[PDB]
Design a protein around this nucleic acid. Structure first.
Lengths: 108, 28, 77, 197
RNA sequence: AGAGUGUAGCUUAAAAGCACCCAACUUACACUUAGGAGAUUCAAUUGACGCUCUGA
């Protein structure tokens, strides 16, 4: 009740959000000859991101292009610190299994 | 799916999960 | 169909892979924390010994947007 | 106070060759393969023979060009499965220590410019390096008058390391020879920010 | 040389709970289900083995 000390004890919408130099939106493009390898590396990089507490929005894929086929994957990233970005991409560089293509391209 | 080695233009052999094991691919 | 011995070997294979990749992630995280704290203390020392350089240490290079670097191979050219 | 301005650069040569799979990883490869056949969904002999003889006729480039040298520390190809770090001996008027390539910088030169100058100062080559950011990787201060040495980081895209028989003592150290060549604690801790992997 | 000293990553936990990982569902994450590893540094509250800091 409004006049009681327990007023607003049940409110939650303020606890739900429905909607210093730092990067913008980062897109990691992974084009690979192997569906299995692309999926495994996508899982690995997503696990690294969510272990290092990086805001990941999307992990979608581009449509296939034939001209054999190369499977494409996307990882979205937002929120990097100075040293954190360095460690992040050096780990990505050193943990690339075999003949895969990375990218740090931006949106649009 | 099988481990076929592939080279694009400059002699860099990479395994690929590819049908019909060729064991050697070269893009001209 | 399958037998009991191969199933037991498969279970032991899963166990040993769990241990192996647990050591792997432990060492990866050890490297993470070690070099992260090294860089943090480096930035702190830079701030202490240079009041005008820590401000330009945080700025980011503008050439990383079209970043490019190929992975490993087997038969070098 | 009189301060000795000194920077440096911890160069990184990435491994061109992926590390060999351990027998444990080989067992897991066999397991993933056999489950792949289990989960799969649907004259060949002549084609198979032709394809296997095509595999056999061409010899694969050796992944390890290291067993034959045993002494080519100056060679850029000392190791392939791991990263390499440039490391040149230096001789001071009062000191003689195996020291990571250093350089002298002035307040008119920024740290990135000092690193770029060091890229070709002591190597006198046409190497191609790349920098990530201005954040350093290590600092070590030894005084006699103040001093400080900044260990930066760079990645080698390509390198025309001409006259490999240089008069210097550039040795490529990955992880192990670091402690053997750099005794003092101000120099043996470089592995803390060198990517051991 | 001295000070703080000390349970696996964290615990005004007392050998526990969180953390951590793979496998399957997930594009992926997540959830869930299955499994996995882990410590109270050595001697009698005390001394000495290891870590951080203060100096040369």
């Amino acid at each position: 009740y409004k006049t009681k000390p327990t007023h607003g004890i049940g409110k939650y919408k303020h606890l739900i959000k429905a909607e210093d130099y730092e990067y913008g939106v980062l897109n990691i493009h992974l084009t690979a000859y192997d569906m299995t390898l692309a999926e495994s590396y996508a899982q690995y990089v997503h696990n690294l991101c969510n272990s290092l507490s990086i805001k990941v929005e999307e992990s979608y894929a581009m449509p296939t292009k034939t001209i054999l086929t190369t499977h494409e994957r996307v990882v979205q990233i937002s929120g990097l610190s100075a040293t954190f970005a360095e460690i992040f991409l050096e780990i990505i560089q050193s943990s690339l299994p075999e003949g895969v293509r990375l990218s740090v391209k931006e949106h649009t | 799916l099988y481990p076929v080695l592939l080279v694009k233009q400059d002699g860099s052999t990479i395994h690929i999960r590819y049908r019909e094991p060729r064991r050697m691919l070269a893009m001209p | 169909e399958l037998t009991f011995e191969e199933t037991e070997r498969r279970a032991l294979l899963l166990k040993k892979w769990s241990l192996y990749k647990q050591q792997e992630r432990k060492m990866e995280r050890d490297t993470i924390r070690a070099m992260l704290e090294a860089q943090q203390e480096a930035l702190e020392e830079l701030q202490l010994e240079s009041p005008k350089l820590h401000a330009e240490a945080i700025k980011r290079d503008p050439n990383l947007f079209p970043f490019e670097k190929e992975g490993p191979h087997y038969t070098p050219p | 106070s009189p301060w000795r301005l000194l920077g440096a650069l911890c160069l990184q040569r990435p491994p061109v060759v992926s590390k060999p799979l351990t027998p444990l990883q080989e067992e897991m490869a066999s397991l993933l393969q056999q489950i792949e056949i289990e989960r799969s969904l649907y004259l060949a002999q002549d084609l198979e023979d032709m394809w296997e003889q095509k595999f056999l006729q061409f010899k694969l480039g050796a992944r390890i060009t290291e067993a034959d040298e045993k002494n080519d520390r100056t060679s850029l190809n000392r190791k392939l499965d791991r990263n390499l770090v440039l490391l040149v001996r230096e001789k001071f008027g009062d000191q003689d220590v195996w020291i990571l390539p250093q350089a002298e910088w002035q307040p008119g030169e920024t740290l990135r410019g000092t690193a770029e100058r060091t890229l070709a100062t002591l190597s006198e080559n046409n190497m191609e390096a790349k920098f990530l950011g201005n954040a350093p990787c290590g600092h070590y201060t030894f005084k006699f008058l103040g001093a400080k040495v900044f260990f930066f980081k760079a990645l080698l895209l390509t390198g025309d390391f001409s006259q490999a028989g240089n008069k210097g003592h550039h040795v490529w150290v990955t992880k192990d020879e670091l402690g053997d060549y750099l005794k003092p604690k101000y120099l043996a801790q470089v592995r803390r920010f060198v990517s051991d992997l």
